[PDB]
């Protein structure tokens, strides 16, 4: 039987701990007014390929390295340059304490304020029913792009997430942003400390979904940003024929900090100087295994003063590697 | 006993997923006149390291991601920047119909006009003897590099490839390029729509190869470009000692669209302002398994008006992974 | 069992040759004076993610492709670009002669002058006792960065290394550098040919180590450089609890070619106007398997004329994969 022993010894020679997964997305975005997605035009057809190496350093720690490449269909000015999107180490300090260090993905609150790249440290204390997440670091994506280390506002975040049943989670968050340069309406302007606090609710009774979120900066006037959505579906990308539909409403005031929202609304701190207010309806359908088509139509877009904005619409296909 | 079976199953988990392959190359190019390969010099000794990830999305769809890096031997100005060279998804809608979407490699016709990166979509029909390939998108590499999306000419291509004889292949193609910016002799000029069309033949039998191709723009004077060549050998990089020799002739006129040809000629639309006409003799030899050595000598290079261009010569070593 | 044997054979069929390894480092560097590590600041905290593919081309040859990405915590101006750091092919013409071609790592002598990226060819000839390594190429990193081929000085190196006793090694080297540009104190200066010859010794016994290196440019005045260090420890990142400590003295003159030293001194030909002379103490400890915490404190930093320089201090975590 030692023959199979040496065969599996050879097994753990030429394979190793690294598991390679990833995805590839082909997306089309557009609007009826020029400049929403690509300057001087009203349509952006682009694609992205991501390859993620997940390696186990030891039994109690693992690290992740993701190589990401974006391109636009026909854009030949520069090569589809690869960028290390995620590079972090995940320590597991037992059954209740976990930590992340490096360039990971952070979600401030329910994701309305920020869900993207974040260089720093994160500590998770989890009862498995009530969870606490505390982060310290720097934002990288969205309205926080283009800032050097001495201009990028540091984020000190503490968030609580509890469950009120099966699949239903409520939560809150409190974050402190230092003085730094943020991008409003394409202009990088400096701002003082902000104490952004908010709450979110999510309910998944049966296959019905009902979610909402409200965040506000404590000291900055006119900063209340909230969202509220309903939906029906059972969307699983790995299972064929599982669809989903949802409709949601966004209301972001003039000074509301929306750096890079987890949602797909087209107006945030970078795009607007007078807020955003309107609906968006999204649809998902897994056409094949590990292949998913998505569509979205955002309408009734308005400014805070009653002015009118541009409707938008997107449609994309996502494919996964591993399994 | 069962634990070993569970370990074998865990191995079985990570085998049908992402498969990592690739290659490396150490190449040297030179010419008898400066500026053909590198600005203000007559030689360029560089390399390349490509790593590709063939991942099966599911039993009827796979995706390919390739990371490449080009560095000159001694050029320390910039780093060996890694680029996503290929990023596409390939679908099989049955036994014959297939499709590709994303940044994939397109070969317009036989490869004399373009065989390189393509941004768009491709549809393949046909079972085993007649194959129809319809591509729609944008060229990226070659004479179409440096253009933006709004300046890049859009290619609508349909090509037919028939199998004749035991393994001979004949074919033709018709492609339409929208108005856009293209690189003529180092300057980006805006050309109108073109309707290019051509034919090719490839008769190979008993270690003897004879190939030919001819393409032409419909509404452009002196735009035809053709190649014709012979060869003898059984080259196969995965088998040691499999040599190969070949010799071929190119003649592409001043307006002939040669964006990035599949052959190793040093002159195309980017380098020549009045055409190209000359011979090239090439040799290949697999010195080891999965290792190959290639050499090439392009001579008799002349302009369409009799002006004499410069000879060129290349020597490269390609190592194939997996 | 026979069916399981056939299954193991089938799995062995689908194994390929590419083995994915790598590492992830989170580092902090600082100095008592600004400009040593980062411009107009006295602290530089950053991170690195490297993923290495070891492909086995055939029985007597392999190739290596390394994708490396360096980022700074908070620096969002320029993305964490992925660069091909190593790309080379290794040939084995028997049990004695080996060759390398491409972009690999070269260790000129003991590593004080250079242990970093190299573009060219290398040839190793020798048995288990004596090794002779001859390399022709270009330096890419260190003080030779930022140069094109026409300015990058070609390096012709030949180094002999003989093992004395067990786990201890002595050796020497002779290297010839052509005329080219080098980054002296932030200014690219064109220098003529150099003939740098040197010796090194590395005595290891049980858990104690005594190392020394001395290199000199033959035709350049005030170009001598040397280091001498003593260490105690049994460091091995793959094993938990294996500590290590060492203390070493660097004395390198104004014209001594120190492009990219394998040590951790911050003053090498690129931020020195009058050389470097001072001590550095380093402490390593593998806190977990494949995880290692390192710290370093360089003090008594002075010029060759007696004018003092700035202290420096570093602290980093290294995570390794694959093995």
Numbering used by the authors:
A (entry chain C), C (entry chain A): 100 to 422
B (entry chain B): 100 to 421
From the paper:
The E. coli cell wall does not contain polyaminated PG, the native ligand of VpOmpM1. Interestingly, the R113-N155 interaction was not observed in the native VpOmpM1 structure, and the R113-G115/N116 interaction was not observed in the VpOmpM1 structure from E. coli. We simulated the native VpOmpM1 model to which an AlphaFold243 prediction of the unmodeled region of the stalk was grafted and fit into the low-resolution cryo-EM density. The coiled-coil does not kink throughout the 1 μs simulation, and the movement of the stalk is due to flexibility at the interface between the stalk and the β-barrels.
Most diderm phyla from the Terrabacteria group have recently been shown to lack well-characterised OM attachment systems, but instead have OmpM, which could represent an ancestral tethering system in bacteria. OmpM consists of an N-terminal periplasmic S-layer homology (SLH) domain connected via a linker region to a C-terminal OM β-barrel. Here we use single particle cryo-EM, X-ray crystallography, molecular dynamics simulations, bioinformatic analyses and functional assays to show that OmpM1 from V. parvula (VpOmpM1) is a general porin with similar structural and functional properties to E. coli OmpF, with an additional mobile periplasmic region that can bind V. parvula PG and take on different folds.
